[PDB]
Assembly symmetry: D3
Homo-oligomer: 269 residues x 6
């Protein structure tokens, strides 16, 4: 029934596949809506004990869809507010989910998709996976500022302020963004083992224990800090950074590859 994702249940586990292989599984408006529908279904289904999220093929996702943004040309605070609200709330579904969520990453896991994975209870990745938040290089702000809650301040500042977007899975594991790096041929099997392990436990026990774990960070004010960063991003995008305006000016004229080249030329080699 879905157009931009796949939804499966197997072995008491739900599996969501971000499914737009020709756009590196970029998260557009439609896909975000379907993710919410799938999470609703997984949460309502007593036969589902855990949720795996992955991308189609050998990419997780490059993040929120910039080609769709180029075409839509949202302008001003009131246009941006609902876009960012949906981005933020969809990502946070994976944190708030009463059932444990596992991100299983191949290839790129960037920007909004990096945030989606950050929100999951666990993240596993292949050696070839790479992570980061390139937003500022595009002239975009950060929608869901989970990074400093997961990896701590110095590393979060480096990744976000420089727009690091090639952080290897091994490094992501060192800093606490990734739980396990696995063999490429074994990613789906490892995610399923973890999910089925969770599925063997009394669901109430898992639910209450996750509640207690999440409470540790919520006690620190994480949800207020996240809402504050989202508010800041609304001001950023509602105004429109000249960096983003210039990026899409090049993109509409010469194409997105040319815009990326233009972007990369502004920064050191």
């Amino acid at each position: 029934t879905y157009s931009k994702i796949l939804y499966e249940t197997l072995h008491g586990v739900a599996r969501i596949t971000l499914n737009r292989p020709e756009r590196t599984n970029a998260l557009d408006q439609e896909m975000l809506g379907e993710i919410n529908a799938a999470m609703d279904a997984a949460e309502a289904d007593a036969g589902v004990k855990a949720v795996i999220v992955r991308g189609a093929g050998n990419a997780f996702s490059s993040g929120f869809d910039l080609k769709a943004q180029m075409e839509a040309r949202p302008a001003g605070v009131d246009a941006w507010r609902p876009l960012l609200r949906k981005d933020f709330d969809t990502v946070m579904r994976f944190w708030h989910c009463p059932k444990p969520t596992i991100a299983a990453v191949r290839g790129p896991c960037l920007a909004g998709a990096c945030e989606l994975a950050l929100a999951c209870d666990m993240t596993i990745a292949t050696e070839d996976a790479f992570f980061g938040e390139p937003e500022l290089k595009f002239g975009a702000g950060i929608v869901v500022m989970l990074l400093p809650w997961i990896v701590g301040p110095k590393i979060a500042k480096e990744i976000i302020l420089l727009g690091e977007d090639r952080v290897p899975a091994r490094r992501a594991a060192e800093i606490g963004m990734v739980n396990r790096v696995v063999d490429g041929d074994g990613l789906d099997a490892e995610a399923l083992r973890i999910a089925r392990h969770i599925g063997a436990i009394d669901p109430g026990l898992v639910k209450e224990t996750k509640r207690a774990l999440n409470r540790a960070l919520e006690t620190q004010g994480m949800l207020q800090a996240l809402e504050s960063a989202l508010e800041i991003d609304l001001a950023i995008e509602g105004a429109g950074s000249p960096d983003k305006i210039a990026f899409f000016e090049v993109a509409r004229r010469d194409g997105l590859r040319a815009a990326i080249a233009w972007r990369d030329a502004r920064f050191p080699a």
Copy 2:
């Protein structure tokens, strides 16, 4: 004491968890004696720091399940004082005005892992292993210190999967362990650290630890811990069917058989 050893040496107090035949499992009696020993250490002006370690080849496997099997606590009102004593005893090592050092070899699991988490520092031998197996036999987490010591993703993995073979080197990578040492060098390293602390003006150490602990307490850690404890009271007061099933096997076939039953529920 019957279930611990308490020593003072070189201006340091040392508590040894002492029931090697039961992997130094923390029963009610032992918890009471730990509290008495900490009271003594805190009152003794000649003591500048506290080391906690296990007897024999182990730190501790955690709260005593055989004792729990036999006592059959049932319901919220029965479980409340058990969990309160568990929690407050572990938290003695955090709140202690003097620095506390966990010196770990072999298993350091469940309630014992939490006891070590509460100490200011943990040192471990190469052979030490850590974790929180609670959920695998239907128990909740009593003292939810883990997400305050290590990253959130790592804490969720260890607790939700009941990881109970986390090697010392990995524990060091994630910030659960300060130093990994040779098996024959544990006691010497712990004493060196404790005597180093003991060379410093005790008031300076006291006020500095106060400031260090304040950083986490400012974040609301004590409220989060109390919240997790209350959640666990509901879990245990109800009694998870996983735990009921585990103890049914344990009573019938013994703990070794019950562990086999437990492990067979999970992937190989």
Copy 3:
């Protein structure tokens, strides 16, 4: 400036701590000049980021103890303004609207370690070493950023033991340092990072840094820091006998001999 160098290059301000004969020790004069330089960098629209580094093959050994030995501040009212200036100067690097980058070679100790902790990023050479030796001198911690930057166990070890030889590699493992580079590549790496930042819309960088800092401020970091500072005012206002003894040796036989006396108090 007398005790720093100030440069602007490629849209970046660079501050060099400059008293090589005293390992760039942060005295009152230098602290005032650092504030003046930060004022200049923050007011200059052509400056997009700030690099801080040291001259003479070192970053800094921290607040100046020779100056303290000579001045002999005594009591709470004398110490309050000294600590206030120390603390506020360090925190300039956190609160700076523009990104700040500590570029460290050789020693980065005590108040200078805290200065680097306050910066948005820290880069270090292979030969750089870090730590907080204060408690060994009988001094308290002025700016208790460490438990906000690294885990609680690691922060307690460094501060309670006065670790002052933490290698760059280890500092990177625990999250105190972002990148370790070759000795001759430090300036170039810091500049590449700063010029990368300088290519971005300044408002975007400003607002994003605000959001990043808000994450830690939401947790109550500024209150925890002020609390630790007030605790330190009591420590220094009273004066630890450890510090009084240290300076008694220093005035008699010199700081060199006082450090030797200090080290002999602790395990080798």
Copy 4:
């Protein structure tokens, strides 16, 4: 709906708690219908604000004790979903993106007092009375909003003594009630306030309420409320002997007799 009325008028939604023969007691069915009505109000762009009131001469006496007597929920797992529904339904009025106004006459007690506390504003007739009688019949507090709305001393008095006759004028003095009006002027005043709100750009109202609620959420209110809810789960899961005794009389002699039994335990 069977147990409520839902109206839209003049750009305002109005929910009427509607079981006058039982003092509009909130049973499971009514709570479900309140949630359905709030879903409707929140989805309807023609609705700018929500009024909640009771049918007849009363707001509500709170959660339905007769229904509880008959259902005999027993243990933690039975009580968990009951309390979760109670709590989440009350908190709809806080979290509602649109402003909520409680319009109270006669009794507004226990769970109903908490429902009114959660609304953005409360207006009351001269004859209205308020409070939290829970502890007097062995029940805990489900939604611990009171100490967030009124001072700590006042909240402790009302809850620990089970005050259940707090007059509207006193409720206004302590900040539980915004305005006291004549008995014949309640509906007009509530509508005037709601239509005033309805004249304002809905987005402006929405964002301003978001900011207002943020002030209390920043203080940790939602964590404190969840903590109190978990404490209540232990209380009710265990079952206070006071409640067991109360319902024994209620089943045998009826609720009127049980209230007499209850009141005789306390000073005249």
Copy 5:
């Protein structure tokens, strides 16, 4: 100064908001002068406390709408610095190391109400009236101090309804005003309070105010205030149709007529 008076008397600084023809409306120039006066008062060791009051039988109607009508700021980047200056100027009175006392007669509205809320104490004449009419103008709240000063229900009523005629007596009941005095006794009462403070060791007052402010800052007030300010930047950056409509009438028929148009939108 052009738009304020500044006096020093009896070791007290007194700032008088001074544009009687515009009800002492706070325009850009006045805000700059208030900052300059506060700088002067804070640097002057002979000043022990600060009184702020208004000229022309009024305190202030708030930020200047006539100036806003003429300037026509449009969009987020234009509004950001305007709101920043508004907010930071108001918060000068909270952060001031010395105690601040608002002495109010006649209107004290909107941004001026927020200014008074930020002061350590507020004294008012019997004829003074308070409130936050912003939402009726289609404006958001710049400085959301109200829920920190008065209860949540009362703050929501004042802000969501734009109450702008709250009498001094009522303001005292809810904790917005400390003392109500006779019209001719305001200056004398404010001066008595300020001179009382001025008799105390300045350091003692300074440190005690620090401790008092810390109570609210510990709760996260500064983060909540910054969050509300960012929400207001979105509101004003977009521009509410209510405000756009208000100024359309104001430019055509004058502010007087625009206020009449505004009032006709709401119940009489």
Copy 6:
């Protein structure tokens, strides 16, 4: 067995009387020690369901004993630290008590004693009772800064920064410091009615409910704010304000009445 307090149990209630009538029941070192012993006893006694604290005769207490301070002459941070720690921790016994605490006030309830009452779950008072925190007028700082948590910011600032020390019971009731003002002849009876009311309830229910109530304020960080104010006071007293030094200079020479006259003359009439 006590020298400076009385301890009674009656009707399942413990009652502590601050007992130094010739010094307005001033709280000296000895009395604080005995209060801690009495609270230990009340907390250990399962027959005790609630605690009433009151003063001997028609005064509650003027606060920590200044005549004792005049004679002891504590000097410096290290001397002051344990004094303030004991002051603070004794006051906070009434907040942390697992059982409900009720302050029953006649006449003066000032300074450290005002803080003791603030810490109690409830406070009742006669019409003749008066409250406040005169510390700053003596050159002393605030030991236990509960006031802004009980009465809110504007009123707390006025009382503490001006050293208000004649706040009538009626006004104390308006601002939330006092629960009930009662007839003079009925204070002891009213406190006992309240305590016996509490005593009729399942003790576990009362205990858990108080825990939940206290958690509301502790969640806001009250204990950290209180420790911070205590730290500030250690600096204040460790240095010694010239106002306090001058006060006791007059007191040792001309007596405490003359010192109070000297003090009052510094402030407006």
